[PDB]
């Protein structure tokens, strides 16, 4: 260490001749005792290196090749300083980066080497793309911009833009984002690219550009579209005049989606109904129907002739927006019956699926008839073309959206309802074809389903025979046949069906229902509903059961707008068909038994089966055939028990042989198979009675080997930026393997304490919680971050509680991985959604001891540090948002305050008190989820009130501090999302609170004149 600095210092003090060898010998001097004894510094060797720069290039082009050496030889440095662990310091390091490429004396290769190590060395760390401040992250995304803007033009102008684009995704997801003002500089480099026709970095731009619109779109809405009506005709002039590179298009398509998304809030048209409107807009909207409907007609817009989907949607949606220059759906009909070859007549096929499907009211049903006509006149060519497919599910979508009106005429009725007849005959004929056998059965579902065509006794021969293979459209087909319409008779057609859907290949293919995966719960009810008295009753008493991206920036835009406010807002069977659909079943169980073999044969086909053979016991026992008692004895239990033994012994094999890769893809598969067999919702259904008898199935000896693997798997050893540690690239084979089990062992631990099962959950949950001891957990791990997530996640549950033991057990990990990852605002981000789930367990305080009080001082802290880092300034609006739901669990799960008190300096502060401060946040997304989770403070939601002083008090509060977040303060944007906090909270209050409710009118009443609300919306507010 003291002979290096010595040699080091020795070497800096030669002369320039004697440097020239001292480079090298520095170079060389590193070794392996010397990095093991320097690990800390390297900030001392990093400036000795710095002043031997700063001496170097102060003494023609003959320096040119020295340059490139010095700047090789800090690489390198670089590469030997960072290669182990980031030692280095991020700061010092990016001022160097900073100041060497700010000025202009050094090269041009040296500046394009300098932001290679800039990219590929300090933007490609975690750490380093955590620790940068949002100081530092402006200036450079300024200075590299500048350098960008630059007249200059070399092959490194691309390289400039990674950068950018790198640098806006670190400015826009590590900090509170770069201020408005910033809008120009990508104006510029718009401006200038339409000069240009190189454009060597737009492709990059705009993808940078497309994140800082997404970043600064909660906020500042008006100013992004008028940045879009300033940028989006030199983008259509761009598209037009350019070379058309797939790449640049793509990223132009995003843009102009998310400037329509920005616009119109989930398709608003108009603008009373939350869209915003402009001429410029409306110019706009027109010039770029007229570029799409130009491109779309074009080779490289889709052999295949259909066209990318995201010009389809966006398409869609310029449609939507334009059809009331006269715009409609007659250029559709006229695209659709004029054009001849199937490459022209693609495109407007699927244009006007996708319209149908997202918006059923955008086609008048005056001009449905002339639609339907055009369709049956384009399905049939007397064999099969590149356009049928595309044709059936047009006709699908058409179907869909006519069940959707009430307000038909009966001539119109009446009318197409010979079409349906007609296209019916048309597609029924030909429904051998196995290519289309998907679009062909989803017509024909669509047809059933809204009693468009009665059923004739030639449709129930396709379920019959080898006509047809079963399949899961054909399964859904037959789902809604039983459920509108009933069997003929020609004990024989019922028993028939049910040999198609059990029909087993003697001796080696496994039957077709076994071979692909099904829907829950779909076969299973209609086997158990073709042996009913009343086939038509059963599917329908089935059916009746209730089961268990920039869409929210448009949702809070209509919340903004007040457009959307959620708030205030027995049986009998035939015993011979019983009998008969159980010697089917006990044939084909018996079947795959014989023909199950150690090692070839699969196992989720097993598991499958046993799953069918349990969900029809179930569907027998939610009606009054069965009992669970009896079913317990039945021979269908028996082979479903045998079925699992032989799977179990599937897992047995690989607890040994940990090593092999070629098991883990039928291990995932059985392992999610199993894992959605059970199900955690208490709702009596044919799901929870099947659930619990696959719970009754698993064996003590196969979940024992379960959690042996998942303790042993455990134990082992392009991007723009920095890779997310919770990112899914990060997991191998073996990593999802584990998370799969884990999920299914932790899903198998909560939902066994209703049933009495073979094994005991009480050691599974053990075993489960010593996955994550202290002396085994290492929480930097990316394997061991999920597991810990996992356990987080899944373990607690409101209904049947952890002992307090196991909960301490829980939490105690969590502080110290909270403060591994601080400076991480993803990962701090989904710890705060994770353990929100521990709040049910934890609020009960029936069994106060002292565990309990630990627990709930325990989870305490570690939210009040999370506070009291937040309000140092120090995460940004999305964990923040996290952390309110996280108080709004709180205020839920203690509504009086008794125990949910966070102590921070001293200082106790209850989470009533605390949940209101959000209500005068910085953004507007974090007002508006504080404002409309507001009601906490007014009823129990446990729907009882709550006392009135405290009731009075709270109201009080939070509009002082509405009105305060108001005081505070081109701008206009700003003002309407204050005025729209304050009338969400003021409305919440009103809806939700009869003792409050003169005291908010009143409030209302004083701020139409003191606030400036604006009365024409607090008057919509006052009629909803």
């Known amino acids: 260490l003291n002979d290096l600095l010595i040699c080091c210092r020795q070497l800096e003090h030669d002369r320039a001749t004697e440097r020239k060898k001292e480079v090298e010998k520095f170079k060389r001097l590193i070794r392996d005792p010397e990095t093991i004894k320097h690990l800390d510094n390297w900030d001392a060797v990093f400036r000795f290196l710095q002043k031997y720069i700063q001496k170097e290039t102060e003494c023609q082009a003959s320096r040119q090749k020295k340059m490139q050496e010095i700047s090789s030889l800090v690489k ?90 790198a640098v806006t995704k670190g400015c826009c997801s590590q900090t509170d984002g770069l201020n408005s003002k910033f809008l120009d500089f990508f ?22 550009l497309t994140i800082f619109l997404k970043t600064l779109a909660v906020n500042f809405r008006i100013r992004v579209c008028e940045l879009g009506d300033e940028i989006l005709p030199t983008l259509l002039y761009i598209w037009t005049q350019h070379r058309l590179n797939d790449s640049l298009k793509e990223v132009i398509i995003e843009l102009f989606q998310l400037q329509i998304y920005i616009h119109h809030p989930k398709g608003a048209k108009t603008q009373e109904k939350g869209a915003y409107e402009s001429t410029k807009w409306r110019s706009i909207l027109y010039n770029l129907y007229d570029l799409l409907v130009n491109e779309i007609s074009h080779i490289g817009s889709r052999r295949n002739i259909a066209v990318k989907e995201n010009l389809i949607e966006l398409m869609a949606d310029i449609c939507h927006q334009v059809f009331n220059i006269e715009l409609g759906w007659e250029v559709i009909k006229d695209h659709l019956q004029k054009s001849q070859n199937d490459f022209d007549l693609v495109p407007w096929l699927q244009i006007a699926t996708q319209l149908i499907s997202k918006y059923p009211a955008s086609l008048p049903n005056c001009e449905l008839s002339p639609l339907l006509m055009i369709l049956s006149q384009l399905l049939p060519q007397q064999r099969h073309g590149e356009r049928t497919p595309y044709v059936l599910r047009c006709l699908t979508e058409v179907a869909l959206c006519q069940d959707k009106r009430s307000n038909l005429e009966s001539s119109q009725k009446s009318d197409l309802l ?46 019959t025979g080898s006509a047809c293979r079963p399949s899961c459209p054909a399964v859904c087909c037959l789902t809604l046949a039983l459920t509108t319409s009933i069997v003929p008779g020609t004990f024989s057609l019922k028993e028939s069906i049910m040999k198609w859907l059990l029909f087993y290949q003697l001796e080696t293919e496994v039957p077709p229902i076994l071979h692909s995966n099904f829907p829950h719960l779909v076969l299973e009810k209609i086997l158990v509903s073709l042996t009913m008295k009343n086939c038509k ?54 079947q795959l038994l014989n023909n199950y073999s150690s090692e070839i044969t699969n196992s989720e086909t097993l598991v499958r089966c046993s799953r069918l053979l349990v969900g029809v016991l179930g569907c027998y026992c939610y009606m009054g055939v069965i009992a669970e008692e009896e079913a317990y004895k039945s021979e269908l239990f028996q082979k479903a028990k045998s079925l699992m033994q032989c799977a179990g012994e599937s897992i047995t094999l ?41 719970l009754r199935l698993l064996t003590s000896k196969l979940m024992n080997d379960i959690a042996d693997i998942c303790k042993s798997l455990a134990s082992f050893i ?52 010593m996955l994550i001891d202290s002396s085994t957990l290492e929480p930097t791990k990316s394997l061991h971050l999920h597991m810990y997530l996992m356990l987080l996640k899944e373990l607690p549950g409101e209904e049947y509680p952890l002992p307090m033991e196991d909960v301490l057990e829980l939490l105690k990990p969590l502080s110290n991985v909270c403060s591994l990852y601080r400076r991480d605002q993803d990962v701090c981000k989904t710890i705060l959604n994770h353990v929100l789930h521990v709040v049910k367990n934890l609020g009960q305080s029936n069994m106060d001891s002292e565990n309990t009080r630990d627990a709930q001082g325990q989870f305490l802290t570690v939210i009040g540090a999370f506070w009291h880092l937040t309000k140092e300034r120090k995460y940004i609006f999305s964990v923040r948002m996290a952390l309110v739901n996280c108080l709004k669990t709180l205020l839920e799960a203690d509504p009086y305050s008794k125990w949910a008190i966070l102590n921070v300096m001293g200082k106790d502060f209850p989470v009533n008190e605390v949940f209101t401060q959000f209500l005068a946040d910085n953004h507007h997304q974090v007002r508006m989820l504080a404002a409309e989770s507001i009601n906490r403070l007014f009823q129990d939601t446990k729907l009882k009130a709550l006392p009135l002083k405290l009731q009075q008090t709270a109201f009080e509060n939070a509009y002082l501090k509405a009105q305060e977040g108001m005081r505070e303060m081109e701008t206009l944007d700003e003002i309407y999302n204050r005025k729209s906090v304050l009338l969400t909270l003021i409305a919440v209050v009103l809806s939700c609170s009869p003792i409050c409710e003169k005291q908010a009118l009143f409030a209302l009443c004083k701020s139409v004149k003191e606030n400036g609300l604006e009365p024409h919306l607090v008057k919509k507010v006052l009629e909803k």
């Open 76 to 165: 390198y440095f670089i590469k030997c300083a960072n290669r182990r662990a980031p030692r280095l310091k991020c700061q010092e390091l990016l001022n160097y980066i900073m100041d060497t490429v700010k000025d202009s004396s050094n090269g041009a290769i040296y500046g394009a080497d300098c932001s290679n190590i800039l990219l590929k060395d300090i933007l490609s760390v975690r750490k380093y793309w955590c620790e940068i401040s949002q100081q530092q992250w402006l200036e450079l995304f300024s200075v590299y911009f500048r350098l960008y803007l630059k007249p200059s033009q070399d092959v490194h102008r691309v390289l400039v833009a990674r950068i950018i684009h």
């Open 718 to 769: 392009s991007t723009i930026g920095a890779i997310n540690p919770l990112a899914e690239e990060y997991l191998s084979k073996q990593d999802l393997l584990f998370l799969d089990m884990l999920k299914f062992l932790c899903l198998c631990v909560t939902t066994a304490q209703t049933n009495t099962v073979s094994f005991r959950a009480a050691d599974i949950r053990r075993k489960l919680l």
């Open 537 to 590: 009753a059963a599917m329908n008493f089935f059916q009746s059961v209730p089961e268990c991206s920039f869409s929210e920036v448009e949702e809070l835009f209509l919340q903004t707008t007040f457009d959307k406010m959620d708030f205030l807002t027995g049986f009998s069977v035939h015993q011979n068909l019983k009998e008969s659909l159980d010697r089917c079943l006990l044939g084909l169980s018996e």
């Open 418 to 463: 010979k079409l349906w007849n007609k296209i019916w005959c048309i597609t029924f004929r030909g429904i051998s074809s196995e290519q289309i056998q998907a679009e062909n059965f989803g017509l024909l579902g669509a047809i059933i389903q809204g009693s468009l065509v009665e059923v004739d006794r030639e449709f129930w021969k396709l379920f």
């Open 187 to 208: 104006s510029k480099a718009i401006q200038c690219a339409r000069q240009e026709k190189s454009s060597s970095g737009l492709n990059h731009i705009l993808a940078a």
């Open 654 to 694: 690989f607890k040994n042989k940990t090593n092999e890769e070629f098991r883990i893809g039928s291990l995932r598969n059985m392992m999610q198979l199993c894992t959605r067999c059970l199900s955690n919702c208490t709702k009596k259904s044919p799901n929870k009675i099947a659930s619990g008898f696959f």
